[PDB]
Amino acid sequence: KTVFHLGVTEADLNGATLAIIPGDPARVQKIAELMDNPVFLASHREYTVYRAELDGQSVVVCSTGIGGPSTSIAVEELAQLGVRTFLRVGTTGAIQPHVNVGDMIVTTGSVRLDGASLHFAPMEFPAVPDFDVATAMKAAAQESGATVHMGVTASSDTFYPGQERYDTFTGRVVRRFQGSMKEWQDMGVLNFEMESATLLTMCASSGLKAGCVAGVIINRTQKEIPDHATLKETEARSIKVVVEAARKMLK
Amino acid sequence: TKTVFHLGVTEADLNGATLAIIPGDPARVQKIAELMDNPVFLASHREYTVYRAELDGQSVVVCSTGIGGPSTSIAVEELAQLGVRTFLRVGTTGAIQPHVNVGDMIVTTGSVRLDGASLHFAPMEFPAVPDFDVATAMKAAAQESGATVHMGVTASSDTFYPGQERYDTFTGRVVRRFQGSMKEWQDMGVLNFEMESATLLTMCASSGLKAGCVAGVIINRTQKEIPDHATLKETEARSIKVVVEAARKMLK
Amino acid sequence: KTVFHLGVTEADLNGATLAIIPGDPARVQKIAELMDNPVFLASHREYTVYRAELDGQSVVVCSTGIGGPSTSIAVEELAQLGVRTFLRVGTTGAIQPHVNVGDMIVTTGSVRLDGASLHFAPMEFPAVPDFDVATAMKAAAQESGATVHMGVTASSDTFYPGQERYDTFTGRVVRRFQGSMKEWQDMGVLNFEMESATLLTMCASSGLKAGCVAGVIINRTQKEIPDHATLKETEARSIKVVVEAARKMLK
Amino acid sequence: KTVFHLGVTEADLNGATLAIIPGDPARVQKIAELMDNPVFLASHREYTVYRAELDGQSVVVCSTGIGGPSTSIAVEELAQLGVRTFLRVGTTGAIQPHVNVGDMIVTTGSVRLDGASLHFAPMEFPAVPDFDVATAMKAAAQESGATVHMGVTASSDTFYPGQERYDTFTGRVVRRFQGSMKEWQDMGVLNFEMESATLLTMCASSGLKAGCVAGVIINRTQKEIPDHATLKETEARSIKVVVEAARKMLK
Amino acid sequence: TKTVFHLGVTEADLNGATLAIIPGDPARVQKIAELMDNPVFLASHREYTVYRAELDGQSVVVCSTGIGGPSTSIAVEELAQLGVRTFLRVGTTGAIQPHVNVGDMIVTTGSVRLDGASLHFAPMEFPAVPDFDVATAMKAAAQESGATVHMGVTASSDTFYPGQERYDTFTGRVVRRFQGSMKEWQDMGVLNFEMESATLLTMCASSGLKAGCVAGVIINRTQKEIPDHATLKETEARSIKVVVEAARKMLK
Amino acid sequence: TKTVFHLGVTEADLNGATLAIIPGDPARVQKIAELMDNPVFLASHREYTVYRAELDGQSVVVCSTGIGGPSTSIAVEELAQLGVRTFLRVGTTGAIQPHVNVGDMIVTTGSVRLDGASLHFAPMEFPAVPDFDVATAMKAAAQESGATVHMGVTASSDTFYPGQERYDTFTGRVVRRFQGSMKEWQDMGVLNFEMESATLLTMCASSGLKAGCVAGVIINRTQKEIPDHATLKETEARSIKVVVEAARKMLK
Ligand SMILES: Nc1ccn([C@@H]2O[C@H](CO)[C@@H](O)[C@H]2O)c(=O)n1
Ligand SMILES: Nc1ccn([C@@H]2O[C@H](CO)[C@@H](O)[C@H]2O)c(=O)n1
Ligand SMILES: Nc1ccn([C@@H]2O[C@H](CO)[C@@H](O)[C@H]2O)c(=O)n1
Ligand SMILES: Nc1ccn([C@@H]2O[C@H](CO)[C@@H](O)[C@H]2O)c(=O)n1
Ligand SMILES: Nc1ccn([C@@H]2O[C@H](CO)[C@@H](O)[C@H]2O)c(=O)n1
Ligand SMILES: Nc1ccn([C@@H]2O[C@H](CO)[C@@H](O)[C@H]2O)c(=O)n1
Ligand SMILES: Nc1ccnc(=O)[nH]1
Ligand SMILES: [Cl-]
Ligand SMILES: [Cl-]
Ligand SMILES: [Cl-]
Ligand SMILES: [Cl-]
Ligand SMILES: [Cl-]
Ligand SMILES: [Cl-]
Ligand SMILES: [K+]
Ligand SMILES: [K+]
Ligand SMILES: [K+]
């Protein structure tokens, strides 16, 4: 039995029950090399898959691509192969002025501005992380020296209009999303990203443990397009954090 | 200065309290207050009975909510007008998972919004989640008490009967939306039903207020055994001792 | 057989098939004493229950608490015990300038700004009273000398944002409710309250007869304070009216 | 000076402020001839318009066509010319077993299974008649010796799937409507027709007085397609009732 | 042998027709039929006037719909019961784009579902799109008549007044949903407003029936000019010539 | 001047292209580019591999989208910022009708919006429709290739598993919304499932961009036979030859 998109078998995972799921296929090897005995397993489409060992236990690293749809495939196929815990690491845009580029955010719940979450549970259901994963992520983030924020994340199926960006081809935002960034800001929402609503709803409704930690690459109080110089330092810290969160989950 | 419209108390009456314990039943208010020091009756109007007491030397409010989001939302608003910023809900609940037993404790990590009042604060997409510090304090208090504690999702309904898929009713029928719903929530891992957490959590999380919910299981919708009087009595007492210890953990 | 919340049995109601349902537990005795042989039955939570006799027929008086959820419990449990007709008497805020403090309103339909109504019928279903109850309420209100208005009531799950109040802790109102008071005013809606949508929808979809009559205790458009003798008279007049409406319903 | 669709002027109405609005253009002359001085005014599309006199006062009779969209045009354009009261007469299918062919139904509220109502008020708003019109309709129906039922009407934008008819080209009903007739029956809904939700919602939200009376031409616990034998007698009774209800509304 | 309840015709009355032309106005039925051979009146009941005619030897129905999806849905259903499988809608419309002139033709490639009856056939997610062969035939016929033809999205409303964002009305009010809507559709590239296409196209695309819509522009909501009476007369005549030639292409 | 944030290309890199071919799989980009003249690798970042090539003398972009509306929406936006106005989507699909075989081609005439990202461009009422010229070009290219071609409605899902009503999954459960949904779409005449067309078509139709979708059938949900490797290889090669010939037809 080889899963349809990831191109791996259960035997390939050497008993892993925890996965680290970054978005970018290029981040997969980078995470895996922070652990022991990393091995490349497969690459198909946006899905690059490695295994490694953390404190003697097998751990998967698998990219998701951007968005809930491609995420949902990776999570499902990994769960078919025995993975039960999913630690998302990603980048994010802050919508509160006091959050700085380089800070870390651990999501306590997501605003479901996606479609895939609805393929698992009706809108009433909360897009919430597993409490142990969130706790582990907070501790790992703090222990790294990062400034960490816990709170609500707005999770959008688009980068552009659903995050109320106006520097676009049309410069238009549909009625639903006009004024939405200020509305979420006033409601205390910390940040925008694109996968947590799907991930957290899928997992919380399916017997899987999940959480999301993200490095802040932009503050929307300043600009819409992230600076490229900020990215590499923020990403290095984020992946150290998520591996330490994985360590806490396995202990 | 001003007296809020429903609760019948002033800011001065609260003696600087910034934390409230909010049970549903007005008769539980005095019982909670008497677990603390120097309890003082402030007011009773409608479903709202209000006491103050001292916990490690700090004033705490105890205020009942009544049943349901609407009455809850009034109490939370009016307490926040008077300086309360942290709200600890303690209440009874029905478990829907076979592994959860009468007498266990549940700390809600998020609520299924089967209510209306939450939508008066945030659109449905918004998560009905607790403040992380409150949830952490509640888990710690509940576990330290020696209880069996479950962290997870709660289904929060505007009705006791059809929205909890009860059929033992005058009409014996449930609107389409709720037919099969208990099994759906069970399959999704939802732990329990109650009637205030969706409103409370959504209101607070979208309004700069810290909230959480801990609940004592008084029925399991899947078990035929009837719980004995002693176990229910004990569960009620343990729930309020836990929420007072969670309040202690929140005080700064 | 004792119902779960109200703490009464069918025998306790002495054959009553009609209930008067105010919101405030303290008003229950005040209504019951306008009838013969009032007797306290139970008080639990927001539910205070009396029985009395009207023209020789037993009648229940039972408070509901604030909001549809607590109302829905009381109506269900009374219906399990044989009650088939429910007369609601309450306070309200008028939103039309021609309606004065002191006037009565008989609801002909409610705007469903609640949640519990949806636990009985989908939103398309009309929150309307039983025609005989509304007719009896109108006649009783007119016979008391009050100016009475028949019309639509906006029935909200909140006192604050859902009634478009801004003098609150946050001072915000969610998008759905911004501009809503003016919208209802322009649509001819008379007043706000917090239980009629649940009550009327529940009863109209469950074979129970229900209606609502309410005393105007504020006008959201008028500046002045009403004097005490008027407020006191309005409360007394409201409960005199509901009892006379009950008399009309019983033969 | 003529309205866009109806082809009539204010002068043509000769002071009428009340309209009788049947669906079928052929019922217009029949209604007008129950009154004094009937005069043909115009016929365009589904809109046939007459005037007549009732107790010395002008009344307009104007067909609507089938459905909310065509109804909404007629109501609007008549209101532009000074009409304020709208009496709907139509045919209907009963869904309760006890409601027989030839009975009359006066709608106390409509299930909004239409689209046009939403162009006047959001779904929460009740599709409710004016209380004076409903009272006049009940009185006219009862005084005529008819068997009369007061209650909720399911008002559908289709004759076929939205009324859960299966004897159709596809034999399919979309998920929303599968099982819907039994749900309405269990909820105590009396009947199906196609215009009341739009009419009542439009009028109740726009300062216009409206009500709906209908003659039962089929009982849906029996069959789907009305028998032709009984149509003429039921329609004659219905229009006699609606004209009397208009008499009761004249000031 | 049955006579359909509203249209008052039998299958035999249609002489084997599998295509219908469906204008809105009963008075246009005879006008369309007389562009074909051997037109014969079949029935008139309510808004439904029904003729039969022959086009290149093949029977065709012409049946009015009335205004709106509800009455349209009845005519389509009852014709389909009698063997009709292809439905060509010809109607009037209001353009909302400045580059579309009074007298141009529009062939709808999809409709904005601002109706209710479409929902009685398919949930809102389903696209209100024409059959591709019908749309192709309509485009070709329109071009061959010398008209300027636009292919694009049509906003299909259950009202003439608020749902087309008209304020020159008895109340002068437009419900929140429709406030600003005309500009929103304009900015989204929508060409025009009418009142039947959403129902027609959704019903047919979800029921195994082929449908399309072609319209002549009788007003432009952005232009202050008032068109000639001769231009309007010519537009009506051209629209029905076009729909008959589109039918010919479908029957070839 | 600017380099777009996700795609990592500039306007100058596109050498004047106003048309893009947008497959799903980054690995298909080079294969499509090599069917044209002078293919040039431009960038690869995340799921976005970008090439340029020349078709009859004109520059054409080829850019992968990844799986799903969200990643598609980014590519489309960023290409539009760089001057692209016409988007030709080629992808794989699962047929749900028995008459549609593996190796056949589908050209979508409208999409069932079972996605979220479409709603970020237009409300649900708006049709997820292709540009008529692109759909016409795709039908012609597909038919001219000798393939069997189906025009019709496509169900476009944000999931591969529950939203396509697959039960052989980790949980084996499908949420209520999607229980029975494949049969409902089948009965409504829907041809196929994929995961990007609703977003793409809605975004473009509401933004002044021309788009269409063509897909090769790689599986039929109603067939038990597994297609052989040669048939799948032929299908993938035919799909990309077809999309390139469709692009040729669109060039002006
Ligand atoms: N301002 C930002 C910054 C980052 N992200 C996240 O990173 C990817 C899109 O750039 C997506 O994976 C998304 O989660 C975002 O959405 N918004
Ligand atoms: N099975 C159960 C058990 C408890 N509750 C809680 O108790 C009150 C209503 O009885 C409400 O406060 C509600 O939260 C419930 O709803 N359902
Ligand atoms: N302006 C007003 C006036 C009165 N009410 C009624 O009083 C209770 C809340 O105060 C509720 O029970 C409600 O019936 C209200 O909601 N709004
Ligand atoms: N079973 C029935 C009977 C009657 N009607 C009403 O009559 C017309 C449709 O035949 C429509 O005008 C509609 O109001 C209906 O909808 N359903
Ligand atoms: N601006 C316009 C122009 C025309 N239409 C068409 O007009 C009929 C009702 O007037 C309807 O049948 C509709 O097709 C419209 O709705 N809006
Ligand atoms: N049965 C099928 C076949 C194909 N697809 C398409 O292939 C990619 C994911 O497999 C996605 O691009 C999707 O469009 C699908 O979703 N379902
Ligand atoms: N660029 C913008 C256009 C419209 N609204 C905005 O807030 N910004
Ligand atoms: Cl309690
Ligand atoms: Cl139990
Ligand atoms: Cl009261
Ligand atoms: Cl026409
Ligand atoms: Cl014009
Ligand atoms: Cl591909
Ligand atoms: K992706
Ligand atoms: K209450
Ligand atoms: K009509």
One-character DSSP codes across E151-201:
EEEEEEES-SSGGGT--SSSS----GGGTTHHHHHHHTT--EEESSHHHHH
Catalytic residue among D51, D88, D112, D165: D165
E40's tokens: 């014969």
Distance CA B249, CA C199 (A): 41
CB-CB under 8 Å, E119 with D176:
yes
* Alpha-helix residue ranges (DSSP H) falling in D5-47: 10-13, 26-32
Instruction: State the CB neighbour count (10 A cutoff) for residue C163.
Output: 22
> Any idea where the domains of chain D sit in the sequence?
1-251
Which CATH class, in words, describes the domain spanning B1-252? Answer: alpha beta
Q: Please list the residues that pair with A77 across neighbouring strands.
A: none
- Treating both helix axes as pointing N-terminal to C-terminal, what angle do B132-144 and B229-250 enclose, rounded to 10 degrees? 130
> Which residues of B sit within 8 Å Cβ distance of A?
109-114, 122, 124-130, 132, 135-136, 139, 151, 153, 188-189, 205-208
> Which pairing describes strands C47-54 and C57-62: parallel, antiparallel, or unpaired?
antiparallel
Q: Are B112 and A125 in contact (CB under 8 A)?
A: yes
- Name subunits touching D (3+ CB pairs < 8 A): B, C, E, F
> Which residue type does A14 have?
N
Distance CA F191, CA B232 (A): 58
Q: Are B89 and B197 in contact (CB under 8 A)?
A: yes
Task: Quote the minimal CA–CA distance from A235 to chain F in Å.
Answer: 15
Partner residue opposite F188 with nearest CB, options E114, E139, E206: E206
Q: Sign of the C-alpha dihedral, residues C60, C61, C62, C67?
A: positive
Backbone angles phi, psi at E7, to 5 degrees: -80, -25
> Which pairing describes strands A47-54 and A57-62: parallel, antiparallel, or unpaired?
antiparallel
Instruction: State the CB neighbour count (10 A cutoff) for residue F172.
Output: 9
Overall resolution, Å = 1.1
Instruction: State the CB neighbour count (10 A cutoff) for residue A228.
Output: 11
- Name subunits touching E (3+ CB pairs < 8 A): A, C, D, F
User: Does B105 carry a binding-site annotation?
Assistant: no
Q: CA nearest B118: which of C167, A210, C118?
A: C118
Method of determination used here: X-ray
User: 3-class SS at D207?
Assistant: coil
CB-CB under 8 Å, E176 with C186:
no
Q: CA nearest C202: which of C82, C115, C91?
A: C115
Residues 6 or more apart whose Cβ sits within 8 Å of residue E173: C186, D206, E162, E167
Distance CA B7, CA B101 (A): 36
Distance CA E179, CA E156 (A): 16
User: Does B176 carry a binding-site annotation?
Assistant: yes
Torsion of CA C112, C113, C118, C120, to 10 degrees: -50
Q: Are D237 and D100 in contact (CB under 8 A)?
A: no
Q: Are E189 and F205 in contact (CB under 8 A)?
A: yes
Distance CA B1, CA B24 (A): 27
Give the chain E residue whose CA is nearest to the CA of D114. Answer: E116
> Which residues of A sit within 8 Å Cβ distance of B?
108-113, 121, 123-132, 134-135, 138, 150-152, 187-188, 204-207
By CB neighbour count within 10 A (0-12 exposed, 13-18 middle, 19+ buried), where does F227 fall? Answer: middle
Strands (E), B127-243: 149-157, 192-194, 210-220
Q: Which CATH architecture has domain D1-251?
A: 3-Layer(aba) Sandwich (3.40)
Distance CA A167, CA F227 (A): 46
Distance CA D197, CA D195 (A): 6
Distance CA D128, CA D149 (A): 16
Q: Sign of the C-alpha dihedral, residues D96, D102, D108, D114?
A: positive
By CB neighbour count within 10 A (0-12 exposed, 13-18 middle, 19+ buried), where does A168 fall? Answer: middle
Chain-centroid distance, C-alpha E133: 16
Q: Evaluate: CB of A166 within 6 angstroms of ligand 7.
A: yes
Distance CA F136, CA E137 (A): 12
By CB neighbour count within 10 A (0-12 exposed, 13-18 middle, 19+ buried), where does D232 fall? Answer: exposed
CB-CB under 8 Å, E24 with D73:
no
> Which residue type does D148 have?
V
A10's tokens: 């259960």
CA of B156 to the centre of ligand 2 (A): 9
How many Cα atoms within 13 Å fall on the side-chain side of residue D116?
A: 35
Distance CA D142, CA D136 (A): 10
A176's tokens: 């639903």
Pocket perturbation via mutation, ligand 2, pick of B194, B199, B214, B218 by most ligand atoms within 8 A of CB: B194
By CB neighbour count within 10 A (0-12 exposed, 13-18 middle, 19+ buried), where does F231 fall? Answer: middle
**CA nearest ligand 3 atom 13, residue:** C193
D5 included as an active-site residue: yes
Q: State which H helix or E strand residue E91 sits in.
A: strand E86-95
Q: Are B59 and B17 in contact (CB under 8 A)?
A: yes
Q: CA nearest F138: which of F102, F99, F100, F106?
A: F106
> Which residue type does A191 have?
N
Q: Are F98 and F130 in contact (CB under 8 A)?
A: no
Which positions in chain D touch F187 (Cβ < 8 Å)?
170, 172
Phi-psi sector, A37: left (phi>0), alpha (psi -120 to 50), beta: left
User: 3-class SS at F169?
Assistant: coil
Residues 6 or more apart whose Cβ sits within 8 Å of residue A165: A159, A173, A224
Distance CA B249, CA C244 (A): 55
